[PDB]
Amino acid sequence: CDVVIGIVNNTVYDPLQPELD
Amino acid sequence: TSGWTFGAGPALQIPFPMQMAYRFNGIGVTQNVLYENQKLIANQFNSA
Ligand SMILES: *[C@@H]1O[C@H](CO)[C@@H](O[C@@H]2O[C@H](CO)[C@@H](O)[C@H](O)[C@H]2NC(C)=O)[C@H](O)[C@H]1NC(C)=O
Ligand SMILES: *[C@@H]1O[C@H](CO)[C@@H](O)[C@H](O)[C@H]1NC(C)=O
């Protein structure tokens, strides 16, 4: 995420990680 | 400013760089090809 112009910072939710862990 | 939306109803604004990316998607090209090369495509277009 350093070549596209206009990127914003946000969280991407992975459904496996919480339930799995 | 609105691509092709105004011909089917109300004009819906969307940034032009994003308009071009949808147009590459319509021909089977993945949309990151524009977003990572936006300057190259715009400069090459302007000369063409
Ligand atoms: C999006 O997040 C990244 C990572 O946290 C930010 O990059 C940091 O930016 C600060 C200045 O705002 C620098 O001091 C850090 O060195 C940067 N970190 C890295 C790893 O490069 C980035 O600035 C954020 N973007 C926005 C618009 O806030
Ligand atoms: C959008 O334009 C503003 C000025 O109106 C500029 O400050 C900003 O960097 C531009 N955003 C992008 C993603 O180029």
Asked whether A5 lines ligand 2 (CB < 6 A), one says yes
The minimum CA-CA distance between A3 and chain B, rounded to whole Å, is: 6
Q: Count other Cβ atoms within 10 Å, centred on residue B33.
A: 13
Residues B28 and B9: beta-carbon distance below 8 Å: no
Asked whether A4 lines ligand 2 (CB < 6 A), one says no
Residues B37 and B47: beta-carbon distance below 8 Å: no
Half-sphere exposure of B31 (CA within 13 A, CB side): 10
CA distance B17 to B31: 11
Residues B24 and B31: beta-carbon distance below 8 Å: yes
Experimental approach was: cryo-EM
CA distance A6 to B34: 13
Q: Is B21 left (phi over 0), alpha (psi -120 to 50) or beta?
A: alpha
**Residues of A near B (CB-CB distance < 8 A)?**
3-6
Burial (Cβ within 10 Å: 0-12, 13-18, ≥19) of residue B34: buried
